[PDB]
């Protein structure tokens, strides 16, 4: 089966967890404490000195988007053909871009930078509304007619931004409905309601 | 009439790797050059999905994000590993390359003067993982993943080339990466491209720094 190794936070594992839960997959959580991380030995063994670390049998992976793409490819959550796969990547790279900005805010410039960030947020979310508007009237998924790993990543991005800036999706009807619809998928709904998700902080420094 | 079009500023930047890939694979493409003046006018930018270039056209398929373009070409040209496991390793390498490219770009555009010394001191620790990956793959005598070239090779190669300009001799501490750069750079179609005016007469970055 699968093992994800990570700090006790949602962070860069939230999306891959939602994917695994929604897809009825089983996995083991190996929690790494701040104390264990500071010891240095685990960190030194990681390829890029970072978690998450992910095990799929004898395969060991690092990088959250590498793990998402791997599950996407192996579980068939990567579009119906090559053309759709490229669109899936384009969405995910866009999600990753905004996630990086979010992470920079949270960890390095929260107090001073929040106001500018929130003011800029509508312009950063609009591309995803536009993409939805151009795919079956936004009624299905972010790419094509089937769920992809980019959907789970985008959903997480949107959920953590509603916490950061309540009402940020109010001007975006397709994104709003999309969040409601995906969140209502029975296995995902169950996971999002579970203490396993709810009782972890979004980030590691108490800010959100 | 070529099926590929690259729309970008007159710089190597985030299009260098994908151009190397296309040239080395003997594929034809069109370059559409966007001046800073045109970009500042704002209408092209507004038409871009995330407000940025590169924009890439493969027939009527329009893509943005340089790594989206690399993965797409990797898929369509068979440069994405021999199986699913290798595909994942290729992704893991490319994400690593992207991470270091982001720090590089931040240095170049955001604080070259203040940050360069610190960056160059941190650099060996940042390059080591790629040496390690090479050491674990056939003694580093072929490619970064498996025994066939991947899009991650072209991206890593570009990363290494631009860091040798930033920090001459930075690869002296990394025998496998050094040999790897020499070896890939000598691939006939790629060697020819890297020597051509089309590559040489473009600056690495958009602000005169390297
Ligand atoms: Ca499917």
Curated annotation (Swiss-Prot), chain A:
This is Glutathione S-transferase P. The modification Phosphothreonine is found at residue 60. The modification Phosphotyrosine is found at residues 2, 197. Residues 1-79 form the GST N-terminal domain. InterPro entries: Glutathione-S-Trfase_C-like (IPR010987), Glutathione-S-Trfase_C_sf (IPR036282), Glutathione_S-Trfase (IPR040079), Glutathione_S-Trfase_N (IPR004045), GST_C (IPR004046), GST_pi (IPR003082), GST_superfamily (IPR050213), Thioredoxin-like_sf (IPR036249). It catalyses: RX + glutathione = an S-substituted glutathione + a halide anion + H(+); prostaglandin J2 + glutathione = prostaglandin J2-S-(R)-glutathione; prostaglandin J2 + glutathione = prostaglandin J2-S-(S)-glutathione; prostaglandin A2 + glutathione = prostaglandin A2-S-(S)-glutathione. Changing residue 112 to V: In allele GSTP1*C. The modification N6-succinyllysine is found at residues 101, 114.
